[model samples]
Target: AFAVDAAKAYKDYLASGGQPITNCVKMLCTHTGTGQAITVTPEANMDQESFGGASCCLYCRCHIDHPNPKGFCDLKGKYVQIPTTCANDPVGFTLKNTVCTVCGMWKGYGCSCDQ
Candidate 1:
């Protein structure tokens, strides 16, 4: 479950045609099932020199914009799950090809479909 503020923020962002660059960072204190806060760590990026792993979720994709004067851009989109598994951590998750309605591009996290 998500926090009330987080959900509201998401709705507002969507309503304004804005995209989330990162995942919800609100401190959710209670987990209804286990009665404990969820434990999570941001994933590390393979290209550490270029980009480090930030707290992003299925809803957003982080990228560097060289041509843009802003230097960075947070593209937003709906989340989609692709079939794959993590090697080092068997319990890890996989993300792929998030559709950015704003940019009209399919963005992949760390890896692309051609890989």
Candidate 2:
């Protein structure tokens, strides 16, 4: 059971123009195995999918989102999916590039666009 939610705390990181830090952006944990500190990182690509460490879990990945993702603003039907601008649809045309990335470990699922 988790009393803390790193997603909610770090949602801001996905709000837009994401943050620019390095290695393990945030940490989440549990009671199992002393519940190692969950780590978060704004990775560059698929090769660096190892975030929290080397435990490997369908659940160890309980911390990430789309491992490899199109910018939130680039999603086909998103509010601002790409070059579209607010000059057109204020509600949907996100002039700023916002990407929806996986906030957890790489679970082999919910990742990759060219798999």
Candidate 3:
């Protein structure tokens, strides 16, 4: 009983633990940004991320499909976005296109659609 109680409390205690999960993303053909994959790392198993559609889950990253987020670019060391347009997708977090490639991800941005 105590162990179960501890588990419940621990789950609530954790929030957006992984900015991005390397292991999870790594399974995603070496993607990057959106923090990381957040899968089975640190043995916490309490990770949160935004992808696909919004199932209305709590703690995880919220999906903003509306407004159709624009794209951004990496100008030299710094980066730039479409300004008015928002970066909707997961990886790049707020960038776009090649930005994912340069930053880390490669598969997720396969000229549109998750491959």
Candidate 4:
């Protein structure tokens, strides 16, 4: 999985008046069968209370289900699906434009996808 480091920057971005649209994380891995090039991009909608301070956002494509999709296939067996953010609230205005501590693979606030 991709490890991103941009927690502080994202916090600043939100302070400047930027609303998060889609947050994503990317990882580089080889196809097991063919050893071909492959990339995994997982995304999620931003939850207001996910980042603890300024809502965390993620961009991951792991939701895609295929017989043998390239990068995501590996995650099938060993992947652990965790809550996107700390707040369990639905992803609407109730949790909109807020901040929480981003956990799991992507860790930060605001737009962490930049990293």
Candidate 5:
């Protein structure tokens, strides 16, 4: 199922002209054998800096917000989805630094070369 997620993620990235939406990008991945779905969403504050000097593909790191199960953010009195930004609506997800295996020669660095 890795292929499934890879194709989908790459497709979405391409469709968006390689620039994932601010905090609305959702990258899906599936377990190799388990077929379990893995959802990866970008955080507004996240960026290449999040990975430091490590090799990476996408600029921002993917993270999940449990607004449903964990409940929405209730900062002070406002019930916002993401407390930090308090601007975006909840979509729900998890996290992972996506690396393109297809980029054989560019595996470690993927597409985003070392800064």
Candidate 6:
């Protein structure tokens, strides 16, 4: 489940008088630079809904394929560093090749795609 769903579930749990989750983070992408995995870490004071799409993959939008996304960039043929911020952030791939669109898209640029 996406962070939003997790937040909702937590909310429901709280409504039922349960404990809250701590340090919740999600997988973002595999960093090509180090051949390691990256994740979206929510801001310390940020709201759950505000976590946005911090967990999106690097291959989203820019790959040769229009729809299905890969963990690595098809154009560059490798994964890139996951952006560290929750807003427009830096990446290793060509910025021109990356994009954000409505509909069933992968997450990145603080955009998380749950569907």
Instruction: Using TM-score, give the best candidate's number.
Output: 4
Where's the lowest-lDDT run of ten residues in candidate 4? 30-39
Each prediction's Cα lDDT score?
A: 0.29, 0.26, 0.26, 0.30, 0.26, 0.31
Better of 1 and 6 by TM-score: 1
**Candidate topping lDDT:** 6
TM-score of each: 0.20, 0.20, 0.15, 0.21, 0.18, 0.18
Tens-place lDDT per residue, model 1, 1-115, is 5323443454466568774343323221221221111113212223211112232332223232222356442322212221223222111222323444443333453333354
* Model 4 misplaced stretches (Cα beyond 4 Å): 1-5, 23-115
In model 6, state the lDDT of residue 75.
26
Report the lDDT tens digits of candidate 2 across residue range 23-107.
Answer: 3211222212211112232222222222222222211234433323441312222111111111222212121223334433222
Residues 24-109, model 6: lDDT tens digits: 22324222222122213322222112122322222332232322244333323222333344223222222222434543122444
Q: In terms of lDDT, which candidate is stronger, 3 or 4? A: 4
User: By lDDT, is 4 or 5 better?
Assistant: 4
lDDT at position 59, candidate 5:
21
Which 10-residue window in model 2 sums to the lowest lDDT?
A: 78-87
RMSD, candidate 3, Å? 17.2
Which model, 1 or 6, shows the larger lDDT? Answer: 6
The 10 consecutive residues of candidate 6 with the worst lDDT sum are 43-52
Model 3 lDDT per residue over 1-115, tens place:
2223322332344443534312212112222324322222211112323332111112122222222234222221222221112222233333223324344333343223333
